[PDB]
Amino acid sequence: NGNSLSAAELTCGMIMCLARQIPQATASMKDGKWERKKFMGTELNGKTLGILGLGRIGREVATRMQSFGMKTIGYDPIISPEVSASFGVQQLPLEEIWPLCDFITVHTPLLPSTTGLLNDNTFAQCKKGVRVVNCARGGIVDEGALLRALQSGQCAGAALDVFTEEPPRDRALVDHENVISCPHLGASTKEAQSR
Amino acid sequence: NGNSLSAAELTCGMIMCLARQIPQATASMKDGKWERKKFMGTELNGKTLGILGLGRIGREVATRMQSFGMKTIGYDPIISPEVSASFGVQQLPLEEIWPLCDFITVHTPLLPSTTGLLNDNTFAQCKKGVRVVNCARGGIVDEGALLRALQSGQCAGAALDVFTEEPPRDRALVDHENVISCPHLGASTKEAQSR
Numbered sequence A, B: 001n002g003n004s005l006s007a008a009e010l011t012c013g014m015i016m017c018l019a020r021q022i023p024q025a026t027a028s029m030k031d032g033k034w035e036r037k038k039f040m041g042t043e044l045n046g047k048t049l050g051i052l053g054l055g056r057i058g059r060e061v062a063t064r065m066q067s068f069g070m071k072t073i074g075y076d077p078i079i080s081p082e083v084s085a086s087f088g089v090q091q092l093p094l095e096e097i098w099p100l101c102d103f104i105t106v107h108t109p110l111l112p113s114t115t116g117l118l119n120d121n122t123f124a125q126c127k128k129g130v131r132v133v134n135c136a137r138g139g140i141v142d143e144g145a146l147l148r149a150l151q152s153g154q155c156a157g158a159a160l161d162v163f164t165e166e167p168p169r170d171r172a173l174v175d176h177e178n179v180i181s182c183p184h185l186g187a188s189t190k191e192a193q194s195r
Ligand SMILES: Cn1nc(-c2ccccc2)cc1N
Pocket: A052, A053, A054, A075, A076, A077, A078, A108, A109, A111, A113, A114, A117
């Protein structure tokens, strides 16, 4: 609410980090390396962004990423297609979303219906090389399925602010070279903190 | 030109990384740590971004950052104030720019008039804690003065894609905890690469 923008901003930061590998590049530079070929990245302009959850945060991510020329599609069981259309997000059924996306971000509560929203079965329906962001709640993305998808290349990268357990006891995702992460920083701004 | 968007995207990446310390945070996570308090960040909405150089890349950065609610001001010796106004950048003389900015980004060629455009003198005229980006040409920002500004806290952070020497032989900037960096990745996208 106060914190809608802090979360939305982080999410968009994570999207740009996935496209360009800024965290990995910084660590390479700090280790004395100059690795130009390794961190060849991708332009966001023209790419499809799937937004799952079209409440305040989802809407704010949408309008920021639209300024980059991203095509913004999404799903929400509750928000009307008229409302989402008013902020430029084309709503489609989930099964239609998966194959279209270059990026996917999640902006849902953690409910039975949203736990492992992204799992083995939904990763299989994505475009190969999809990139995924979870700055919402840990568990929305099944962590085992994400690791399997990163191992195969089915997922090319992921940005995680939240984890099923916090801090995560299993370090395989954090340790993966194509994973960027923060210690649940989504509301951690000076501004969000004072209403 | 092809590559205007690749550069502009990287610059906006670096702005978001400075606000939220995403590269540092990822390193912290990869080192096994969960340091939430340490990486308290800042919201971009409502902040002032100064854009020095209002050509194609500067413009594109402007319109993207404007979607985050940033106030975009700037300076260019060639572009008229009515023209910059038409893409939402308020032009002011340089001396007026320094004290207003929360973030500064440079988008100039490397000329005598732009080498060390940011130096000891212009850092002193900035707001304490200014954050700086150079995704343009190495040397626009005086590297020595930038280090001194980071050491004093006058500059709270910097993001560098380019260096006076590449790879940089002097490692003090790169190694600083508030500096994020890439190995000259501004045009390093699959898309920019094929015209
Ligand atoms: C109850 N509920 N469910 C969602 C949802 C679930 C799956 C995908 C997108 C959105 C959002 C809310 N508030």
